[PDB]
């Protein structure tokens, strides 16, 4: 039924219209399953459609709700950047601002040279896990001279 164009190019990422919407839009970063289901419910569109069955007047509404969530009554405890450390905002950072925020957070930490930044610099484990018997990336060392 209705073999129409399926491959979508949503902002800076490729979606396949061969999948269901609630699991197709998770291909974008910052959008998981629990977030995408809510973004699709608030937009009043159906949830049994393949992602190719959406004409150009649904996708636009879906993304404008996906990017301005607090406008459409998506709560605060549910967003992936809350009390933004340097601006006090609440937001979902979605596609490319995610990598920029992550690198900005790592660089902020390394700047004041806190301990987390020093573990991020030396490529070690940042939480409090033992590193004596895990990680194990290098090569075997020979004991016979």
């Amino acid at each position: 039924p209705e073999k129409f164009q399926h491959i979508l190019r949503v902002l800076n990422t490729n979606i396949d219209g061969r999948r269901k919407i609630a699991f197709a839009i998770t291909a974008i970063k910052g959008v998981g399953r629990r977030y995408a289901h809510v973004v699709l419910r608030k937009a009043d569109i159906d949830l049994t459609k393949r992602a190719g069955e959406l004409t150009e007047d649904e996708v636009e509404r879906v993304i404008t709700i996906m990017q301005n969530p607090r406008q459409y009554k998506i709560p605060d405890w549910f967003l992936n950047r809350q009390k933004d450390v340097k601006d006090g905002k609440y937001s979902q950072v979605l596609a490319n601002g995610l990598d920029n925020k992550l690198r900005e957070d790592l660089e902020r930490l390394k700047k004041i040279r806190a301990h987390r930044g020093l573990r991020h610099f030396w490529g070690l484990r940042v939480r409090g896990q033992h590193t004596k018997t895990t990680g194990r990336r290098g090569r075997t060392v020979g004991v016979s001279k």
Binding site: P1, E2, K3, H6, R18, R50, G52
Partner: protein, 75 residues
Amino acid sequence: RDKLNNLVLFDKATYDKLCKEVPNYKLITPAVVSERLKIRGSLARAALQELLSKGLIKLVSKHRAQVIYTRNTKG
């Protein structure tokens, strides 16, 4: 693994072949219909429920993990 490129929904050729197989198959299950054509297997369930609605196939068993139909309780 491998690459099974199945169809997410029918086209007219597969759509007529799906109605031209009804008298042929003694056992009808979603997996058999998936293997005959190139169907995403979750579309085969909808196709068989549609065929059942039109009286074209007869349900012999339905369970959570298995469904079975047969051709018009004949032959």
